[PDB]
Structures are given as C-alpha cells and as structure tokens.
Structure 1
Amino acid sequence: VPPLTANQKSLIARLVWYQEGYEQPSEEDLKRVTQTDMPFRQITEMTILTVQLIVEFAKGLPGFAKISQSDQITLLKACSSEVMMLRVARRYDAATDSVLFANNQAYTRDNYRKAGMAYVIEDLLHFCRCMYSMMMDNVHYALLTAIVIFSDRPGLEQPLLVEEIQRYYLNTLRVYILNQNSASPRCAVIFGKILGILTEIRTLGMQNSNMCISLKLKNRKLPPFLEEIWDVA
C-alpha cells in the first residue's frame, strides 16, 4: 500500500505549519484595524488582511519561487478570492449559521445585508454548510489550498510548469487519502468530492468579482488594494 515519500511528508508538515501560522492576522494587525458604515468597513478591512495572509501562504509554498514574477501575479489575482472561500468555510458555525471573524464576532446574513453585500452571502453560507458537511481535516485543507493556487489560469506564460507543480500536490493528496483509509475503493469518492470543491469555488470567486464591480458602480468605498487584485475596472 503506497506510502508517503519523505518529500511528501516534509511537504505536508510544511503546509500544515504555514497554514496555521497564517490562518489569522497578527495580533498587531488585528488590534490596529479593530482600534475603533461599520459592517461594511470591517468586512472590507478584514478582507484586505485575509488577502495579505493568502499571499504569504502562497509564497511559502514549494514551487512558487520557481514561477516567473508575471505568472505569480496571474496566479495570485485569479486564485485569491477562491482560497478566501475555503478560509470562511473553516470559520463557519453551523448552529448559528454564521461566520466567525478573527475578532470572534459572529457575522450573519443580516450583517452582510446592512453592509450592502446581501448578493454574496446566500451562496457563501450554502457552500459553508456543504463544506462543513464534508468534515475536512487540516491536511486536505492545506493540500487543496495549494492545488487551487497552482491551478491553470488564462494568461499563464508557463502553464505546463504550473501544471507539473500542481500535479505533485494532487498526488500527495491522493496518496495521503489512501493512507487514511487503507486503500479501499471509497478513497476515489473522498478524493472526487474534494476535487469537486474546486468547481464550486469558481462560482463563488466570480460572485466576489461581481460584488466588487457592483460596489464600485454603486459608488461604495471599496479599498484600492482589493480593486487592484480583483481587477475592478
């Protein structure tokens, strides 16, 4: 039964370390922001912090520094809203049907309404329910995040390099699943359901795009950091 090679385990451990080190903003970053359009400003300001964290996880990934500066921006701009969806899934509370922010306040459908983001919250919470219905662990989550980052995106100069890099992470994920379940047939089902997430976050990511465009058109105060990364023309 296919074991994990020394490099796959070293890879898994690294990603698990970077993951929990970057899952919440630093104490000082968080205190600076909370040092206080309330829902709207905390949603947008926390989203800046989240995107900063995603970028720092990405750069810590093996494979990333091997990719040209132009393709790094292409990968980061395209994938950052999708990875953000995995991060909210981990902070979702089923019992209260809400998202737990880094300050420990629970944000409901109502808070997103008052912040003018009712468009986005329905499908997000549904995703969260479906995503916490899966009961995913830290390794699945870490590997999946790397798989999203190294996905094929339009405008890549070296998409075969990126594919090769992503292929190593998919294999690590597949072999890690086989080692969790003693290589039974249902390993394909677990692996398939996980890969299925890649497709549902493309919808949510595009909804995030539309929300940003909408906010700009409705003359709402959307930060330039976010306008920049998500190409809100």
Structure 2
Amino acid sequence: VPPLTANQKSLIARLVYYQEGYEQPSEEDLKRDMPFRQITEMTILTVQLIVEFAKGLPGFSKISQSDQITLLKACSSEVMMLRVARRYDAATDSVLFANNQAYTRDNYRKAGMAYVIEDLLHFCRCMYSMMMDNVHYALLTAIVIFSDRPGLEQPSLVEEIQRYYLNTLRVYILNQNSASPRSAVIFGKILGILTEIRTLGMQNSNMCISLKLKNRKLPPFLEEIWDV
C-alpha cells in the first residue's frame, strides 16, 4: 500500500491547483441566423484554455514542436467534453456552464442540432455517476492529452509520459481506498471513460463536416484544430 512518492504527491498538487485557474467557465466573454454563434464562440474560448492547460503540463515541452500540435488536435475535442461534462447539474439534468446560453437543450435545438445535445447529456449522466475526485479528473485530463494519437513522431515518448500520470492515479486511488480490491474497479471505470471520449470526439469531427457542407459559419479556428 505504498503512499505516493513525494514527486507523485507534488504532481497531484501542481495539477488540482493549476486547473481551477483555467476554470473553463471563462469571463473574457466580451462579444461587444440562429444563435449557433453562442455555442460556437464559447467553444472557441473553451478550446483556448484547454490548449493552455495542455501546456503547463509536466510533459509537453519534452515532446517535439509539430509532434505535439498533433496531440492537441485530437486531445482538444475530447477533453472539451470532459470540462462540459464536469458541470452537469443532477437536479435539473443539464449542463450549467455558467448557464450561459452556451449549451442547453434549447439553443442546441433552435440551431438545428436537436439530436446532439441529447447524446452529450447521456455521457454526462454517465460520467456524473462515477463520482470522480478533482485528482481523478485532473490526472484523467492529462492521461487524455498524452493518449497515443495516430501520426506521432516518437510515440514511445508520449507513452512514458502518459504512463507517469497513469501510475499516479493508480497509486492515488490505491491509498484513497486503503489497498482494498475495489481500487482496480475504480481505476478501471476511469480508463473506461477514455474509450467513450473517443466516440464523442469523433462524433464531433463528423459534425463539423456536416455543418461545413450545409453552408455554415464555422470559425477558422475550430476548422483548424479539428480540421474538416
């Protein structure tokens, strides 16, 4: 039942703290057709912090230049679901992203993406049921950044990094559960998300692609990141 090293302990620390800062719900909102622009603008800012969070991370600089930018194109769309999903209020059954007109069953419905919000929320209940910590979630986000993408220069690198994180979340949930066996299950259900985050991430790209050839105003930033 080894407790976290000092470097592990210190790592969990650097991340919880260094996450609240990029508290997705951003205030920089200064916006001084269908409101598809709200959903859309928001996303932009959001993706923007994510890319920044994706940096101060005890790994990145190590990875190459152009190699890393691969990690963000993939990592970003998925990791955004995580931040929106972290907000799902049980009481009302909806995402309360500073409940801006951001993403709600309404706007989404008005902007003709009816079927989508439905799916987002499913994965929202799903994630809300595991009761993750703040460490769970942090570490989780990182393990997604360094998740192995197609076309990585030295995937062997991104893989020893991501494993560092991966071991901390294990040792963490281990002590947190005082060596009982449940731990593996807890740990399991977490990696278990990583696989569902991929469907949603891709269900996404196929969405840009649909709005793109149905003539729509998708910002040269999104089209960039999650290219179409």
TM-score interval, normalised by the smaller of the two chains: over 0.9
Q: Is the 8 A contact 1:24 1:102 kept in 2?
A: no
Do the aligned partners of 1:119 and 1:211 also contact (CA within 8 Å) in 2? Answer: no
Identity %, equivalent residues: 98
Tell me how far 1:71 sits from its aligned partner.
1.2
Residue 224 of structure 2 aligns with which residue? 228
How far did 1:52 drift? 0.5
Shift of 1:197: 0.2
Q: Is the 8 A contact 1:30 1:103 kept in 2?
A: no
- Contact residue 51 and residue 84 of structure 1 kept, 8 A: yes
* CA distances 1:56-115 after superposition (whole Å, capped 9, x unpaired): 101010011000011111000011011011111111122222111235557432321112
Q: CA deviation at 1:178?
A: 0.5
Deviates more, 1:88-97 or 1:62-71: 88-97
Q: Distance in 1 between matches of 2:162 and 2:26?
A: 29
Greater helix share, 1 or 2? 1
So what's the TM-score if we normalise by structure 2? 0.95
When structure 1 is superposed on structure 2, of 20-29 and 6-15 the one drifting more is 20-29
Is the partner of 1:76 in helix, strand or coil?
A: helix
Moved more, 53-62 or 15-24: 15-24
Alignment coverage as a number of residue pairs: 228
Cα distance, 1:28 vs. partner? 3.1
TM-score by length of 1: 0.93
Equivalent in the alignment of 1:107: 103
What is the alpha-carbon root mean square deviation over aligned residues?
Answer: 1.6
What's the offset of the Cα at 1:147?
A: 0.1
In structure 2, distance between residues paired with 1:107 and 1:160: 38
CA contact (8 A) 2:142 2:165 kept: yes
CA contact (8 A) 1:120 1:208 kept: no
SS at match of 2:160: helix
Distance between the aligned counterparts of 1:193 and 1:203, measured in 2? 16
* Unaligned stretches of 5+ residues in structure 2: none
CA–CA distance in structure 1, aligned partners of residues 217 and 66 of structure 2:
29
Larger mean Cα displacement after TM superposition, 133-142 or 116-125: 116-125
Unpaired segments ≥5 residues, structure 1: none
**1:150/1:4 Cα in 2 relative to 1: closer, same or farther (>3 Å)?**
same
Q: Are the counterparts in 1 of residues 55 and 61 from structure 2 also a CA contact under 8 Å? A: yes
1:120·1:207 contact (CA, 8 Å) conserved in 2?
A: no
1:156-201 CA-partner distances (Å, limit 9, x unpaired): 0010000000000000000000111101000000000000000101
Cα 1:48–1:207 change in 2 (3 A) is same
